[PDB]
């Protein structure tokens, strides 16, 4: 079997987190990059790390990968996330009226403020 041990997987995830811009989908160029950015005796381990590093890059293209934190890509998602619509969602429902059940109608009638102005029974 060919299972990447935690020694290889942890090193590969560290390599991608720090050298994402210099990595590719090709094992042979990634191996050259990894050779001078890592210190290790084992040539076999470096080759195994290059294999899993390329695997992570292919996974990263398809979507987010758990255990990998790219700080630049975190901004861009958190950028489009905080783009509020021109109107708040509560405004659209309120201006179009709110439909409430009969039990809700009896609750509002007994309040001090009474029935809300833009609320109508279903």
């Amino acid at each position: 079997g060919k299972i990447r041990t935690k020694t290889v997987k942890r090193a590969s995830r560290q390599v991608v987190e720090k050298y994402y811009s210099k990595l590719n989908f090709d094992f042979y160029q990634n191996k050259r990059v990894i050779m001078d950015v890592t210190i290790a005796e084992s040539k076999k381990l470096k080759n195994k790390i290059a294999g899993y590093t390329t695997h992570i890059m292919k996974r990263l293209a398809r979507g987010p990968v758990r255990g990998i934190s790219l700080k630049l890509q975190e901004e861009e998602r958190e950028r489009r996330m905080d783009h509020a619509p021109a109107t708040s969602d509560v405004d659209k429902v309120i201006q179009s009226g709110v439909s409430v059940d009969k039990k809700t109608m009896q609750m509002l009638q007994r309040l001090e403020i009474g029935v809300p102005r833009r609320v109508k029974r279903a």
């Binding site: 007994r110 309040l111 001090e112 009474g114």
Partner: protein
């Protein structure tokens, strides 16, 4: 003047444990579940002043899921929560 005294008026108690405001139970040194909740006091205008109201709830009450009901009862007596809505 709460505690143990002699005829010489020496308070011989090591300390005075907190008494729960809901159950009138002494709070032991190893409860570790008894909590202390401070509720800020609002002024005429809708802004907190520098004073808060402090409540003590015993740990055993929270384990039974009765602290929420006890705190509701305490705040109503203390004049913090409105028990029922007014006339429509």
């Amino acid at each position: 003047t709460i505690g143990m005294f002699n005829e010489e008026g020496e308070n011989v108690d090591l300390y005075i444990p907190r008494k729960c405001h809901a159950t009138t139970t002494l709070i032991e040194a190893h409860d570790h579940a008894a909590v202390q909740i401070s509720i800020a006091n609002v002024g005429p205008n809708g802004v907190i002043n520098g004073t808060t109201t402090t409540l003590c709830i015993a740990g055993y009450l929270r384990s039974q899921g009765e602290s929420d009901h006890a705190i509701n009862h305490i705040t109503i007596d203390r004049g913090i929560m409105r028990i029922k809505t007014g006339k429509p």
